[model samples]
Target: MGKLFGTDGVRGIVNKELTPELVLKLSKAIGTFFGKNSKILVGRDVRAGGDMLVKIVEGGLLSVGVEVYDGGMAPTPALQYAVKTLGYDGGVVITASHNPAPYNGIKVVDKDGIEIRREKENEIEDLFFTERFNTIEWSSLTTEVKREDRVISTYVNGILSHVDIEKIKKKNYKVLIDPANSVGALSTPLVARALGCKIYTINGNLDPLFSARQPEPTFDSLKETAEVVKTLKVDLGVAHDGDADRAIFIDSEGRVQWGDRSGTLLSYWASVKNPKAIKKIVTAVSSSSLVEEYLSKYNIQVDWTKVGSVDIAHKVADENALAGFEENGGFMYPPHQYVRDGAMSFALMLELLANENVSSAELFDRLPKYYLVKTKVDLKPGLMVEEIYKKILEVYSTSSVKAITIDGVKIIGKDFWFLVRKSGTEPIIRIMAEAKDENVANNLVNELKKIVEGK
Candidate 1:
C-alpha cells in the first residue's frame, strides 16, 4: 500500500485525517493520472462526508479538464456497472465501504470498472506526493459536469439479465433486506421488487449516521436483523454494508451465513450455469476451507488469494473464474462484473433458491459444516507484525501442516486452519480460524491470539 492508498482505496476519518485540502489535491492527482479530456464517472455512497467529498472530487477533476459525469447517490457496484457499460474512460467512487460513519474514501476505477490496479494506485500516489498534477487553462475547462441518472436503473437491469428472472419471479420469494441505512437501500429493493418478491426492509433509509448498526455486517452486528428475518418468516434476509458492495445472508432459520458459505453455493451454481467457463473460483485466504471441500465435489478448483476484494476480483478477471468472494460478505460474479456487488449476489441467491426448491437453511446445509472465529489484536507500542508472522510460522511449520504466506501466514492442519494477517484497512492484526468443531475453532483462535500478542 502507498501513503495515500490502502488495499482498496484512500480512506481516513472525514474532516480530520481526510480534509478538503487533501481531497482536492488527491483528486487532482487522480485527475492527472487519468489525463486531461478523459471522461470519468463519479459517484458517492451516503456516508457523512460523501457529498462534500464528491463535490471536491468533481471540482478537482473539472479543474484538470477531465470530463466528470456525476452519478449521484449510488452504491459502488451500481456506479461500477455504469462506468463499465457507459463507455467512460474511468470512474471514481466516494465511499468508506464497511468502515464506520466517521470515515470516507476515494476509490479509483479503471475503464473495466474494477478498482485501479495496485501499480496505478502507486502512480497516483507518486503524482500526489511529487505535486506533479496536470492543469488546464480557464478556457479549456469548457464542458460542465453532466448528470448520469441511468446508473441505478441500468445496474438493476444488468443484475436482472444475469439471473433467471422468470424463475425467480415465479417463486414469489418473500425477502427481507437490511441495507444498513446506506446506499444499498437505493438499489437492492428495486431488484427484489422486479423479481416479484414480497419485500421487507430494515435500516432501509439512507442515513449518513448509520443508526441501525455498525457498517460491517458481522454475526454480532447482524443478530437483530437475523431475528427480524425469522420474525417476518422471509425466505432469506440480505444485509449490505455501508456501500452495499457486499451482501451477508440470513437463512430462514435466522442464522447469518458468512460470505464464503453463500459464496461456495453461488460458485457451484455459477459453475453449473456456465460449464464452458473456466471451472475455477477465486477467494481470499480468509475464507473457510469448506469452499475448497464443497467445490471439489463438482470438479471445480479453488484458488486462494490475498485477503481483499481487489486482489480476488483481479484474479477472477485474469483467470476467468466463475466467481470470487471474501469471508466478509463480498461476492464477485465475473459474468455481471468483476467486483463485489451486493445486489447481484442477492439476485443470484434468489435464482439458486428457485432452482433448488429448498429452504435457505436447507440449501446452505448442503455444504460441509465449519465453525469460524474472527478476532483482532491491536498493535501495541513495541509489538511488530513481521515478528508475529515469524513466530506463527515457527510454531506451525511442521511437516504435517501446510503454511501459506501470500498475504499472511495461514497454517492448514488436517482438521482446522487459521490465518494471521495485519489489517491493511485498520491498525490491528486480524486472525481468522475455522474447524469442523466449534471448540476447535475457538481454541485455534485463542492459540493464535497468544502468538500474535507475543505471549
Candidate 2:
C-alpha cells in the first residue's frame, strides 16, 4: 500500500477508499499517540460521507478514553485555532480540502493549532500500521462529550482584533463571496459583514456533492464568480475551497489573480503592518520568482520551503518569519497563528487595502510582473516515481539552467523557471512555470507536461 500520510494528512476517496472503519482505527491511533485523558476537538467538512465519518472518529476517540468535543461542521482553521486557545490537547478535521466530491480526509492539529508536523504524522502512522492502539475499560470512558458553540465567533473575533475593522467599516466595501458550497459560508460572510461590506454570495449553502463546481478556485473554476464581480462592479471577489482555509481572489477589474501574486503583495503589506521591519517571509519553490525579485527591493528576504503549508508554517514559526504562503492561496500570517486561514487572509487583505487607500487592481500594478501557468498529469500504476525524477535531472543537467531539487525538480533559466513535483495530496505530477512573457510560461508548462506524460 502507499504511504498513509501525504503533505497534508490521511486522505482518500470516501466510502470506497476512506471508510468509517479506517477513520475509526486512525482516530484511535491518534488518541493513543496523544496518550490518555487528552482533550481532542473534532470537526469536518460537508463532504458526502462526512456525517458518518465524524461520528465514528468521535466514538473512536471516546473509546480510547479521550475527552472528545464536537465543533460541529467548521473550517479546518477554525478547529486549529480553537484547539490551541481552548486548551485542548489536539484536534482533528475531516476534510479533503479542494478535492472532489467523493474525497474526504483527516487532518490532525497539535496543541498549538498548527498541523502536528511530519514527525507526528509519521508517528501516528506507525501506530496505525502496527495496530498498537489504546484500550479503555467501559467505566473509564468520559460520560459526556462536549459541544462547542462559539468556535466560529471566537475565531472571527481573533481575526478582527488583528485588523483595522473600524477603518474597513468606514470604507463600506462591496464584495462578492463564493464559499464553494462548504464551510466558508460559516465564517467569511460574518467577517465581511463585520467589516461593514455589502456582500453577494454564490454557492453559499452546504452541499456534499458540490454540484456548483469543483472546490479549487482557479481561474477556470472562477469564471462565473469573476463575471458576477464585474456585473456587480464589486470591490473584490473572494472564494474558498472545501474547508475555507485558502482564499483565491478576483480583483475589481474582474481578473482572477493567483495566490503567489496576492501573497507577494500581502508580504509587502504585512511588513508595513509589522511594528518592526519584517526582514523575511516564507514561500515554496513553486511560487513565482517575482516574490524574491520584488520583496528584495524592500529588504525582505524570501525564504523557500518545501511545497506544503505544513512545511512553510513550521519554518515560519521556527524562524519567527513574518509570514508563510503557497502559490495555491494558502497564505499564513504568523501573528494569526501558524495555519492557513481563509478568513484571516481575507481580513488582512482588506485592512491592507484600507490602510493603503488603494484598489486591488492598483496593488497588483505595484507588484513585479510575471506570467505563470500550471498543469498536471495523472500518476498511474507501473510508473516509477524515481524514474521520473531521474529523467528530469538527466534532461536538464546538460542544459545551462540551474536545477534545485528541494521538494521537486526546479529548473531555472535567465527569465523563466519551472517546477515539476508530485502532488502530496493527489495522484499527479504538478508542473508550474513562470516567465516574463505569457507564451514562454505556457510553452514551458506544456513542454514539461509532455515530459511528465511521456507524450
Candidate 3:
C-alpha cells in the first residue's frame, strides 16, 4: 500500500483517491487511536467534499463512541484553537488548504491545537492499512455530534485579547481582506471590524470552487488583489489559503510580501513585548535568510527546521521560541497557540504597525531587503526524485556554494541562496531563490530549473 499521509495530511481528489469508504475507515482509525469514547472536535472548510467528508468522519467517531463537537465552518486555525481551548481529546479539519479545488484533505489536530505529530500519523496509517480499528457493537451507540456556534465568536475574542486593540482603534486603518472564498470570510471580517479597520472584501463569499482566485496566494494569483490594495491605498491587504490558516500579505505600495519578511517583523515586535523571554525564533529552511539577518540586530537567534508548520511549531515549543513561520505565510505565535493562525497574524500585523508607529509598508521596508523568486516544475511520470536531487546537488558542488539538507537541497552562497526540493504535498520540485539583485535570483532559479529538468 502507498503512504496515506503526506507532510500535511491525507489529500487527494474528491471521491477519487479519497472515497467515503476510505475516510470512514480512516476516521475509525483516528477514533480508535484517540481511544474509544474520546471527545473530538471537527470542522471543515468550503471545499466540495467537506460536508460529506466531515459527516462520514463524524459517523465513524460516533461509531467508536467518541463524543463529537461540530464547529460548522471556520478558518482552520479557529477550529484548531477551539479544539484546544474548548477541551477536546483531538480535532480534525476537512481542508486541503492551498491545494486546488478538485482536492480535499484531512488535518488531524492534537489537543494542543498543533497538527498531530508524524509518529501519531504513522500510528493512524498503520491502523488504517491493517484494519485494526475500533468497531462498536450495536448495543453501545449513544453519543451524538454537538453543535458549536460559539466557536467563531470565541476565536475572534481570543485574537482581540492578544493584540493591542485600543491602539489599533486609534489608527482607524483601512484594510482589504481576500479570504479566497472560503471559511476565512466567516470570521476575518469580524476580526478586522473589532480592530477598528474599515474593511473592503473581495472574494469574500463561501465559494468551494474558489471562483475568485486559486486558493494559493502567489504573486501571479494575487495580481488583482494587489491592484485593489493599490487602488484603495489600504493600510494592508491580506489573503488566505483555502483553509485560511496561512495569510499572504500585500503592502501599502501593493507589493506582495511573503511570510518571512512579515514574520520576522512580527517576531521582533513580540520579542520586545516580552523582553525576558528567550530571544529566539524558529522557522523552516524554506524561509528566507533575511529572517535571521533581521532578528540578529536584537540579538535574536533563529533555529531552522524542515519545511512544514508541524515541524516548526514543535521546535518552537521545545525551544520556548517567541515565534515561528514558514515561507508560505504560515506564522506561529506561541502566546496564542502553536499553530499557523492567519487571523491572529492579521491582528498582530496591525499591532506591530501600531506599536512601531509606522505604516504597514514602512515596517516591512525596515526589515532587511532580499529579493525572492519562487517557481516550481512538475514531476513527470517515472522520473527519479532521488536522481533529480542528486543531479542538482552534483551541479552545485562545482561551485563555491555550501549545501544545507535539513529539508532539501539548499545552496548558500556569499551573496545569494536557492533551495530546490520536491514538494511534500504535491508532485512538483519547488525552486526558491533569493539575492540582493533580481537578476541574480532569476539566474539561480533558471539554472536550477535546468538541472531539475535535465535529468
Top candidate by TM-score: 1
Error of 3 at 427 (Å): 6.7
lDDT of each: 0.90, 0.86, 0.86
Cα deviation at 113, candidate 3, in Å, is 1.2
Candidate ranking under lDDT, highest first, comes to 1, 3, 2
lDDT of 3: 0.86
Candidate 3 lDDT, tens digit per residue, 132-203? 878888788877688888779989998898987888999998999999988998888899999888999999
Model 3 spans > 4 angstroms off: 374-402, 424-429, 446-455
Worst 10 residues of 1 by lDDT: 1-10
The total of clashing pairs for model 3 equals 0
lDDT of 1 by residue, 163-270 (tens): 878888999999999999989999999999999999999999888998779988999899899999999999999999988999999999999998889999998899
Return the clash pairs for model 1, or none: none
Worst 10 residues of 3 by lDDT: 395-404
What's the lDDT for candidate 1? 0.90
Q: Using Cα atoms with residue i matched to residue i, what is each candidate's TM-score against the true structure?
A: 0.95, 0.92, 0.93
Candidate 2, residues 1-455: lDDT per residue as tens digits? Answer: 24688667888899888988899999989999888889889988888888898889988888788888899888888888899798889989999988889899999999889889788888898999998888798778745778987789989998888988899999999999999999889999999999999989999989988888899888889988889889999888888999988998888999888898889888888898884945799988878887887888989998887878887888999999998888899798888888889899889888888888889878777876777788889876788666777787788665677777888788777678888998855889988888988999999888778778765
Order of the predicted models by TM-score, top scorer first: 1, 3, 2
Clashes of each: 0, 0, 0
